[PDB]
Amino acid sequence: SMEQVAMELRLTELTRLLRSVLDQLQDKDPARIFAQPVSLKEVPDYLDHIKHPMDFATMRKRLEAQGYKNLHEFEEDFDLIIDNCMKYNARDTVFYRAAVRLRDQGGVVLRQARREVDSIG
């Protein structure tokens, strides 16, 4: 149908906007701490601690499959990255501190994204 096509154009455009959001958030992680999945070879007990692992490469795979239906879903994944790190790592660690800085800096980007998503529909 023509409606399914229109719906698909909207998803494609959301995917375009979320790609730009993802790039901007990932720039706030210059140490690349959150770039890839925590390695189960190197942290063999990880899944005993963290039930839903997340990282920027994993988000990017979902994004490029047009797997985010709305900004809420995308934000859920970004928040997992931060919240998983803040649980597994102690306060006095470069990892925890990196997550705090990512959360704080990302807030700004995500605030305007929400306005853009609502504004453009």
Curated annotation (Swiss-Prot):
Where is it located? Answer: Nucleus; Chromosome
The record's account of tissue expression is: Highly expressed in testis.
Superkingdom per UniProt: Eukaryota
Q: Domain named Bromo: which ranges? A: 9-113
The cross-link described as Glycyl lysine isopeptide (Lys-Gly) (interchain with G-Cter in SUMO2) comes at 41
Residue span of the signal peptide, if any? none
Subunit structure, briefly? Component of some HBO1 complex composed of KAT7/HBO1, MEAF6, ING4 and BRD1/BRPF2. Component of the MOZ/MORF complex composed at least of ING5, KAT6A, KAT6B, MEAF6 and one of BRPF1, BRD1/BRPF2 and BRPF3. Interacts (via PHD-type zinc finger domain) with unmodified histone H3. Interacts (via PWWP domain) with dimethylated and trimethylated 'Lys-79' on histone H3.
Task performed by this protein: Scaffold subunit of various histone acetyltransferase (HAT) complexes, such as the MOZ/MORF and HBO1 complexes, that acts as a regulator of hematopoiesis. Plays a key role in HBO1 complex by directing KAT7/HBO1 specificity towards histone H3 'Lys-14' acetylation (H3K14ac), thereby promoting erythroid differentiation.
Name of the protein: Bromodomain-containing protein 1
Query: What is the scientific name of the source organism?
Result: Homo sapiens (Human)
- What is the name of the gene encoding this protein? BRD1
Whole protein: which stretch is covered? 555 to 674 of 1058
